[PDB]
Amino acid sequence: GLAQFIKVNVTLENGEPVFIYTDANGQVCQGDITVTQAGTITYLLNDQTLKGLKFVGVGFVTPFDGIIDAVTISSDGMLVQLVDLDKTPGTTKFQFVLSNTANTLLVLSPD
């Protein structure tokens, strides 16, 4: 399989989080992966908000669709990985889920 890597840069604009994805070549993208083989997608948190963001998981409105097989997370909340093991065809949408140190609300990336 292929191991893809995307950096999740989070800044604040007008006091609220903005998610900017950058790829291996440092280019801004939308952090979509059209996947053609079994593999992994690794998302690395670059928190520039001063709000103590940490990944707590990856959320799905259609979590049983089989497009993503599993989610793994590092102990420090700096990395999350999506595993696609069994190549179920189709498309799914997801939102990162993060804790923050300013309040007890979870943070979601846009739908």
Partner: peptide
């Protein structure tokens, strides 16, 4: 983001 599986 979105993921598109094209096996």
């Amino acid at each position: 983001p979105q993921i598109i599986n094209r096996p």
